[PDB]
Design a protein around this nucleic acid. Sequence first.
RNA 1: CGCGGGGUGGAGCAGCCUGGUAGCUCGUCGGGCUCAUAACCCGAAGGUCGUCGGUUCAAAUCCGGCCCCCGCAACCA
RNA 2: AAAAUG
RNA 3: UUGACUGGGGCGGUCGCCUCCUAAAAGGUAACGGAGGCGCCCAAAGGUCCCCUCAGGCGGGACGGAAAUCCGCCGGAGAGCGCAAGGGUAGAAGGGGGCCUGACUGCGAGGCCUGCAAGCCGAGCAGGGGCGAAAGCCGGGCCUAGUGAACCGGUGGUCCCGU
RNA 4: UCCCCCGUGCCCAUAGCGGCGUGGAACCACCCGUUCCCAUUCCGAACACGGAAGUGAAACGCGCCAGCGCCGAUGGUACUGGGCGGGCGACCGCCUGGGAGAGUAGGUCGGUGCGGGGG
Lengths: 181, 44, 85, 136
Amino acid sequence: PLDVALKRKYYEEVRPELIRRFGYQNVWEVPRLEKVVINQGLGEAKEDARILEKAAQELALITGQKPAVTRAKKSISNFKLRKGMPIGLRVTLRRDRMWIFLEKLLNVALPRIRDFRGLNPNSFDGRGNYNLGLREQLIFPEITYDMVDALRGMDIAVVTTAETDEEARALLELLGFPFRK
Amino acid sequence: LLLECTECKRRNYATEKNKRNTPNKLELRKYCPWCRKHTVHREV
Amino acid sequence: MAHKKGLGSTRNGRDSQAKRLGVKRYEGQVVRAGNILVRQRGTRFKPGKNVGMGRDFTLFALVDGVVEFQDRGRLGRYVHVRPLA
Amino acid sequence: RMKYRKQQRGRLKGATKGGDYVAFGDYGLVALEPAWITAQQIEAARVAMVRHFRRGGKIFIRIFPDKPYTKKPLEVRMGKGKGNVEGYVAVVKPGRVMFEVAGVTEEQAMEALRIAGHKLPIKTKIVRRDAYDEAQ
RNA sequence: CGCGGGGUGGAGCAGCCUGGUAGCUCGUCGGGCUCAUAACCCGAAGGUCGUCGGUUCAAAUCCGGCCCCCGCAACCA
RNA sequence: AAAAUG
RNA sequence: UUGACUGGGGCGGUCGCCUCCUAAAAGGUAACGGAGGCGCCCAAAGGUCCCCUCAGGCGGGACGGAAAUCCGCCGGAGAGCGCAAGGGUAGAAGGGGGCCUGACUGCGAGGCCUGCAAGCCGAGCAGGGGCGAAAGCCGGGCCUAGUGAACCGGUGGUCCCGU
RNA sequence: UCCCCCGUGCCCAUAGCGGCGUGGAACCACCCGUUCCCAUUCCGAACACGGAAGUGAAACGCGCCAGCGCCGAUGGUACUGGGCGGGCGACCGCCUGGGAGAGUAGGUCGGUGCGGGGG
C-alpha cells in the first residue's frame, strides 16, 4: 500500500532488460510509465429516476479515487440526451494508486475475463500509449456478484513516456501484459 | 414585469424588472435609500 | 387604354440610418479632456496612453493634449494623447 | 448552380483581363471586343465545334457564365426583374481566350474555331502558341 | 401577371397557426357463418406525409424554391 | 302473434 | 369622416427601428433597387477576484452513428460570444468557480451626432457600498434594434399651495 | 571591455514550422517527498509547500540547415488627380504628375534597450 511488486519489479527487473533489449543511455530517455485512465460511458441518466451515481462509486472501489461525472459537450436528437448534464464517468490514477490497480488488474481481472486469450497487440498500433475496454464490472476482486445490479464495463487507457509502440509494447509485455499475438 | 423596490417601512422605489414564471417572486436586494444610507428594498 | 398588370414582390424596401463612425480626431489635433476620438464598430482602435473607451468602444481623451496614433501589428492599432508644456 | 444571386448589371471597362494565353489545347480563339456571352451562345458554339469534326479531339472552354441576366415580363416598373428567365452569362473583355482546341490538324483545328466565331456575338481572332510561358 | 386554398397508407376526409402522441370511413389480407355468394362477425397489414433545403435537441407541423391541383380578381379610357 | 341472390 | 407614397389613379405592396450592399477608399447620399432582422430576453445571461481555451482533422479505445464519454498528437482561430447581419474578440468580450447586487443616490468637465426635439459616450467630485492582499474594477448585459412628444388620467410619496 | 545565464521590455513572422549537435560549473528545469500553507467537478498532473539525492531524456537556452512558412526589389504594366484629341456610335489614343497587385532576382532560421548572477 505504498510500494508494490509491479512498481518494484518495473525498476529492479524491467528497466535493465529494457535498457539492454532496446539500448538507452539516460534513465529518462527510458520507457517510464505514469498515467492510467479508467473511464466509463454508461449509457444515460434518462427517465425512471436514473441516478446512476451507483456504478459511480462501484467504480471507486475497483480503483481508489472518485470518478468525475462527465457531461455532454453537444446535443444529439438522434439518441436522446442533449445539451448538458447527462453522464460519462472518468478517473485518473497516477503514481501509487495506479501501480497497484494495474497489478490487481494483471493478476485477477483479465484472467478472470469471461474467456480470455490475451490482448490486442494492434491496439497501440504504433502511437505511443495503449488502450482497452472491459465489458464486465464484476471482474474485480473488490466487487461482488450479489453487489452489481447490472452489467456495464467500460474502457481504460494507459500512458507511456516512450514513443514507438515497439518500446511501449515491450514495457508492457514485461509488466505482464498478456498478448493474443 | 415592471418591478420596483419598496424599502421596508418607508418609501422610495428602484423601478426594476423581473421575469415571473422564469424563477421569480420574493424579489429584494440591498439598494441605497434617499432617507439616510443602507436598506434591502422588497418587491411590490 | 392598352393597360398592363404589374405588381411588386418588393420585400426589400429597408435600411437603418447612418451612424457616422470613424476617427473623429486625427493625429496631431490638440484636444481637451472628454473629446471622443473614435466611433467604432468593434475595437478597431485600441485605447492608448491617456485614452479610455466606454460601452460602445467609443475612445475618448482623458487629458488635454495632442493625439498620436500607432501601429502594433499583431498587437493592434492604438490611439493616445501626449500632454505638453 | 449556387450562392445568393440576382446581381447588378455592372460594366466592362478596358479589357485589363482581355488577353490570357493558350493554356491547354494547341490553337485558340481570343476575343476582340467586350461583351456578355449567354450560355446559350457558348454551347451553340462549342456544339458546332465538336460537331465540325465528329469523333475528334478535345475542346476547352475557358470562359464560363455565372452572371444572372434579369429581365422584365413586358410591363412597367416595380422592383427588380423576374430576373434570369433566359438565364446567365459570362463577361468577356477584349483579349480573353474563350475556346481552344487540340489533338488535331491546323487545317481541321483552325477551320473549326472559325465557325464558332460566327456563333459568338463578337469579333474574334485565332492564335497558335509557342509564346508566353515561364521557362528558361 | 397578381392574390389564397390545397398535395397525408389504395379512395375520400382529419391532424399543421397551439413543433415531440399520425386519427376516421371505405376498401386490401386472414379466420368464422352459409350448400355457396353477399351481407354480418372476429383479427391483421399498409404511409420516403409533393419535391429540392433552411431554423431547431426534434419538422406532417415553422420559414423560403419550383412542380402539377382549385378558386377570385385582371377595371377608366 | 314472425329479424338478398344463386 | 372615410390617410399618404405611387414612372396617371384603382387593385397590390408599403409606412417606425436594426444590419450588409448600392455609396464612386472622411462623413453623408436616391429609386415600388438587392438581401435579412426587431416591437423581446437574462434575478444570472449582471459585479469583482481566481482559474481554464476553441472547431475541427488524425490515430487508439465495452456497449459504442458518421462527433455521446477517455487517452494521445496536430490545429491560432475557421468555434464561442442569448436572437439578423456586421465590426470586434482567445495577450478574452469565450468556458467554470467563490463571494456579491454599482440593473446605486447627488451630479456632471468635455465631446459625438444634429434644422428643431430627440439619441449617444463620458473622465471627475460627494455620499454610502461590492469584489480583490493590492494596483484596482463596479451607475447592468462584446457592441450596435427590443421603441412613442405632449395632453388626459391612475397609483403612490413629500419640504410646497390650499380663496 | 568581451563571453554565459536568470528576469524583462521593445521591433511585432526576415524572429515560424520542421530538421541537425550541443549546454548542467553556474544558473533553469525536470526531479525528491506530501507533515504544514494551499490544491484539483477524480488525480500535488496543474496550482502549492518542504527538500535537495539523480538527470540534461523531456522542456528551455545556444548554434548550423531552406525543404514548408514569412519577407521581397528593380524593371514593366493595370488603374489614375489634371488637361486633350479621333469616330456616327461600341470604343481607341496622346500630353502632364502619381503608380500598384501579381511574377522574377533575391532575402530570412532574428534584431535590440534595462536590471541582475558567474569567468
